[PDB]
């Protein structure tokens, strides 16, 4: 299935197309010669400015190391990883195909082709950097709504996170580490000749199958639900603390209404409607915040029988001694819960923003990524039935099924692939 | 088993005076509230008075009020209402309720215990 | 001085159908109403308590529901015996108790 032209010696680690030693041809696969110059062109365009952008923000980080703090702090690891795959993927655009591709050579018949293997090449230093701080950076985001929930169901601060740091950069680079060591010791490195980095699950089916497409899937996922539990432990502590406030608001208002008040009868009317706000009160709310309200509508028993019986003035008495009960147990409450859940509100504002922004390029890599995982023995079909007489091979016995696939899909997976390192700004700036 | 007995209706004329009693077994009134509610032929019920025999909190419905008289007594532990000068459309079914305090399940566990209820009527 | 309105006047259901009895509150009285059932000639019966909570020794087929100032009563089963009058009464105090207007759960035919 292989060509004089493309055939290597063997036990390096070749293997195209299923078959030992072949290896796909590196300056054409099948486009044009002027489509891939301006793909070329397009994709050091946007690295230029993507690592111009993101040394924007590690230089930010440099002007003060304390600026950011645990529960942010993870955004500057983003940065720093999304950086290092600009960097790579502009170093593929300004060393061309001088790196990722053999070289040819004429007097043993041999065409220029994709390095896969180990040899002696820094294409597996390429790969080492830009699968692991691609990995990295997704895993980074996982961390942070980790630690996004870690500040919404079981209420931290900027130092209980600070004392799992360890485990999370173990994590964080223990996963892609590993991942890494995993792909490097069974030989599935390969190397891109649109760009001009190396990258795994680019000509192999499974390794973009269950070994990139998979983990970038499986922390979709586990962030978004991550990020979903936050959302309604938040809305459920956030309009749970709004319907406590509306009912203490009705019953401090209330209080003041029954203060400067006369006659028998609106001290009724007004009472009546605390009795009601107090017993929804003690349903919202440990121990001693149930039973202080417990306390309070027996406070408002004793003063709605002063009432009944037509005396005035001693409900006057009797309302005036719930203004310490309200100031002994509760009333301190509320602007430390107001305060806890609003900076939160903006931070959760700040994460949404975040994440819509981020995950749009991540979803669009990860369509991407499935449309290659598809039709992969399609387009390979049309490349043997399309190129047959140059490479001598015999052609495909039948089922043509004539498909290019098109330049707009894998330009967009290399285009969303790198400007995810932009909304790092967006919380710099 | 905890269980009330209501007695003392029957046969009144217009603006005369009736008592009933709602008797106890089971629980004291000292624990419980006791309430009064009628109900009249073929329309529903409405409260018209209760007791709480701890402290002593009497109040009635607007309908009866100063009209209507009720009591307790904790040695027989029975709960008596006294009528005078009734109209004609107080003729009901009257039924004694039992109704815990403040806190807990017994306040909201609300009328729990019923008596079988008596019957009065206005005899023009 | 608190109204509650209690809707549908007279229900005609079957046997093991679904009744739902709404009742709503003019105040904002909490979640203390009381859904009593009265057989014609005896007393009331309580059937739920708090709004939510079934009373120990009605069946389980009835339950309780509240929503801000309207409250329902939901029978999933309707045995021959739950023909009746069903009876919605607030308690925000022992001085405030106003009953509904009733429903007679009639048989349809």
């Known amino acids: 299935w292989c060509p004089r032209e493309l055939k290597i010696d063997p036990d390096l680690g070749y293997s195209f197309l299923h078959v030992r030693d072949c290896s796909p041809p590196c300056p054409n696969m099948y486009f044009r010669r002027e489509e891939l110059s301006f793909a070329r062109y397009f994709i050091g365009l946007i690295s230029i400015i993507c690592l111009s952008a993101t040394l924007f923000t590690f230089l930010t980080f440099l002007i003060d190391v304390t600026r950011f703090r645990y529960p942010e702090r993870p955004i500057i690891f983003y940065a720093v990883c999304y950086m290092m795959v600009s960097l790579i993927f502009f170093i593929g655009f300004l060393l061309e195909d001088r790196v990722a591709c053999n070289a040819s050579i004429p007097a043993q018949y041999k065409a220029s082709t994709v390095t896969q293997g180990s040899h002696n090449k820094a294409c597996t230093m390429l790969f080492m950097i830009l699968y692991f701080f691609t990995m990295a950076g997704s895993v980074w985001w996982v961390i942070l709504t980790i630690t996004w929930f870690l500040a919404a169901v079981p209420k931290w601060g900027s130092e209980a996170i600070e004392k799992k740091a360890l485990l999370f950069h173990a994590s964080a680079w223990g996963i892609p580490g590993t991942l890494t060591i995993i792909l490097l010791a069974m030989n599935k490195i390969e190397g891109d000749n649109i760009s001009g980095v190396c990258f795994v699950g680019l000509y192999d089916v499974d390794a973009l199958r269950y070994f990139v497409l998979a983990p970038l899937c499986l922390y979709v996922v586990v962030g978004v639900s991550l990020l979903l539990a936050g959302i309604i432990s938040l809305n459920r502590a956030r309009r749970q603390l709004a319907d406590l406030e509306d009912n203490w608001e009705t019953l401090n208002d209330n209080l003041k209404v029954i203060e400067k008040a006369d006659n028998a009868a609106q001290v009724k009317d007004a009472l009546t409607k605390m009795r009601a706000a107090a017993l929804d009160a003690q349903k919202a709310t440990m121990k001693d915040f149930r039973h202080g309200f417990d306390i309070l509508v027996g406070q408002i028993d004793d003063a709605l029988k002063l009432a009944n019986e037509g005396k005035v003035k001693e409900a006057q008495a009797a309302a005036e001694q719930l203004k310490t009960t309200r100031n002994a147990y509760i009333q301190k409450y509320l602007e430390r819960a107001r305060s806890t859940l609003d900076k939160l509100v903006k931070f959760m504002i700040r994460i949404g923003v975040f994440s819509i922004l981020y995950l749009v390029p991540l979803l669009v890599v990860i369509g991407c990524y499935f449309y290659e995982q598809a039709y992969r023995g399609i387009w390979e079909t049309t490349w043997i039935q399309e190129r047959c007489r140059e490479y001598h091979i015999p052609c495909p016995y039948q089922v043509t099924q004539m498909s290019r696939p098109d330049l707009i899909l894998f330009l967009m997976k290399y285009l969303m692939a790198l400007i995810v390192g932009i909304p790092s700004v967006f919380w710099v700036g | 088993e905890v269980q009330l007995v209501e007695s003392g209706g029957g046969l009144v004329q217009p603006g005369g005076s009736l008592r009933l009693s709602c008797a106890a077994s089971?629980?004291?009134?000292?624990?419980?509230?006791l309430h009064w509610v009628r109900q009249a032929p073929g329309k529903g019920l409405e409260w018209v008075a209760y007791?709480?025999?701890?402290?002593?909190?009497?109040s009635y419905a607007d309908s009866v009020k100063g009209r209507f008289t009720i009591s307790a007594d904790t040695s027989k532990n029975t709960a008596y209402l006294q009528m005078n000068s009734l109209r004609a459309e107080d003729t009901a079914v009257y039924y004694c309720?039992?109704?815990?305090?403040?806190?807990?399940?017994?306040?909201?566990?609300?009328?729990?215990?019923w008596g079988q209820g008596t019957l009065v009527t206005v005899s023009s | 001085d608190i109204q509650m309105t209690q809707s549908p006047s007279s229900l005609s259901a079957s046997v093991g159908d679904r009744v739902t009895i709404t009742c709503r509150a003019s105040?904002?009285?909490?979640?203390?109403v009381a859904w009593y059932q009265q057989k014609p000639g005896k007393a009331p019966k309580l059937l739920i308590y708090?709004?939510?909570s079934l009373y120990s020794g009605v069946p389980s087929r009835f339950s309780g529901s509240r929503s801000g100032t309207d409250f329902t009563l939901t029978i999933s089963s309707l045995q021959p015996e739950d023909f009746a009058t069903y009876y919605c009464?607030?308690?925000?105090?022992?001085?405030?108790?106003?009953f509904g207007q009733g429903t007679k759960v009639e048989i349809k035919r």
């Open positions: 309720a039992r109704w815990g305090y403040w806190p807990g399940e017994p306040w909201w566990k609300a009328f729990d215990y």
């Open positions: 089971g629980f004291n009134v000292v624990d419980f509230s």
């Open positions: 007791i709480s025999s701890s402290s002593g909190s009497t």
């Open positions: 105040q904002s009285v909490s979640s203390a």
């Open positions: 708090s709004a939510s």
């Open positions: 009464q607030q308690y925000l105090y022992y001085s405030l108790v106003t």
